[PDB]
Amino acid sequence: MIDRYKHQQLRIGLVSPQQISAWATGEVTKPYTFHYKTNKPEKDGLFCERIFGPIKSGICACGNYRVIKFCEQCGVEFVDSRIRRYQMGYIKLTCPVTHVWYLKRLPSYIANLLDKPLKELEGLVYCDFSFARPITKKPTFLRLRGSFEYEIQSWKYSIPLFFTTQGFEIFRNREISTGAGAIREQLADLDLRIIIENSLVEWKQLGEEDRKIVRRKDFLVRRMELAKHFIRTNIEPEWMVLCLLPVLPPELRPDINELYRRVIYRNNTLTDLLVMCQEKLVQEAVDTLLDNGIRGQPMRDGHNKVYKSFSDVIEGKEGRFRETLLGKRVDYSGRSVIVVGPSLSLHRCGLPREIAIELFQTFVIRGLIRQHLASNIGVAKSQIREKKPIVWEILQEVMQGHPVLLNRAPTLHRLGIQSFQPILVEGRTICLHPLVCKGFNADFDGDQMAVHVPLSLEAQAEARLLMFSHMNLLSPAIGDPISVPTQDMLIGLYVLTSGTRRGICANRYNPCEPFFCNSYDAIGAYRQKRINLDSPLWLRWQLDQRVIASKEVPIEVHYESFGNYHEIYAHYLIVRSVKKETLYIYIRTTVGHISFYREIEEAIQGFSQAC
Amino acid sequence: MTMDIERLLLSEDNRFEFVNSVAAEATEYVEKNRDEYGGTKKAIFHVLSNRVNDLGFDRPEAYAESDPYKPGPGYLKEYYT
């Protein structure tokens, strides 16, 4: 067989400022969210209707309307408000800011690719440190190496005075620079192949010669591994420092808006100046927006409460991955307290009228309309709300053959959710079969269950042919039966099959019972109070010897001179003869063993006859 | 119908394929004759009965049965839990 090939993929990659612009194209320039009076989206703000899309689909910021492209006065599109959930914006940062994930997280990717200690980069980005010789692909004329913490006295007055201002600034950012701009310049002019070769040769030199002699090696292996991945992909190492800041769509942030304001609050302040301190404030605003809590003390709000960043909202047990994506709340679902029903079949459950009418509402509407008892959908829904007596006939009709899924709360294995055929029961409780309680680990002291309705034909087929209880009698753990009688049923069976009192518990003195043609006679005598449940009796047996008993020789053989002999065992009597081939069997038993055997036999025979 | 479902799976190498084929046949049934299903006749039950009948074993159509003892219109059986 040729496999039905399906080649589907998804990939993440570090994004480019050009791709950010293509997302937004659309720049958010003002930190205003809404008008204080009219509660309208402020233009160029975090909720700008021109940037992100029309609130109240098909209307402009002015108030015009068109049938569901751009307006002239306010320039708002004519589309659905769906776009406000997907359209991105961007913030044009005056200075580049590094991405916190790629600088502060350990081990730092920027530090390893640039090959400098992390404290040096942190001082360069946060403190007032200037880096010497940031780029190499352009010539220089100075002998400043490393990152001098102190400002160079000559570079402050002498060289700027000799080299004036315009040309000096023209060649300024080629020998000395500071902040994330220097880091981005270093990343942009990196030669990755040279990095790989230098790392390999240094690794060989170290090897040809014992803790940090190894840790330096692991850095070299890590760096050339990191350098290789940039060559074969389309990612650029300078994208780890951000030039633009994408903005979340407004409808996803109806806390986050506060952090977006601060970026605009401090970036628009910085562009007014154009100073070192304000550049750092913009960088910290982006870090708090992107990832709080990595920089030691996390920035708090006025209430001394830690802000929540995108990393916080995507990670953790309550994050997007583990709470919104791996589990969902669903429609066509109900819940109620479960009570025991011993008269139910193993494949049936009982549903309250309210839960059933809610879950099967659309099917009841179809049933109403189909037989001309409802003119339209609205009339049918009004009839359903009025609890008309004909709503329940249609509900009972449409529930036939449509399975439902029950589920108890702590689903520890797959038998924690099973499929049953719903029937309408009075009250407000879910009627549950007693033999399926062990699979659900359910008892009737306050437990509740959820109900789900498969809608499509494929789901109904799956529920009927895979999840019903009569095809799930074995547990997948070891293969043992899961629907075994327990407690009350087990006690009843034990009492039924506990035979006669024997020995000194039957007779007061040392002994120095009715005979029934068939089991029906014995059971009839029991019904007429002629015998007890455990009183001994002899039953004529006309089948093969199939009674479980100890493998023992007869207690006593009564051999007659005419040829017939009687063999007396502990639990049966066998009459044989030498003249004939006759062989009679009488079983010493009670009405209880007969009843158990007849129950199982009649179950088998009735199931066979019904098919 | 439980016995019939077990019988149909005795000739199926894969049960998931059986479920998919039954669902596809039921979908064809509903698409061809939409109005005949959803009430007393269910498409999946009709498919199961037809597959049982195709073996030569007589079954009521779609296992559709009613109560002959309903005391006229409007009366709904009250189940005894």
Binding site: D3, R4, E462 | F16, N20
Partner: peptide, 17 residues
């Protein structure tokens, strides 16, 4: 599970008679 393995001549030409 169920998702595994991706789930006119002879007309207008009769005998004139």
């Amino acid at each position: 599970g169920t998702g595994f393995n991706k789930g006119d001549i002879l007309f207008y030409h009769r005998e004139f008679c």
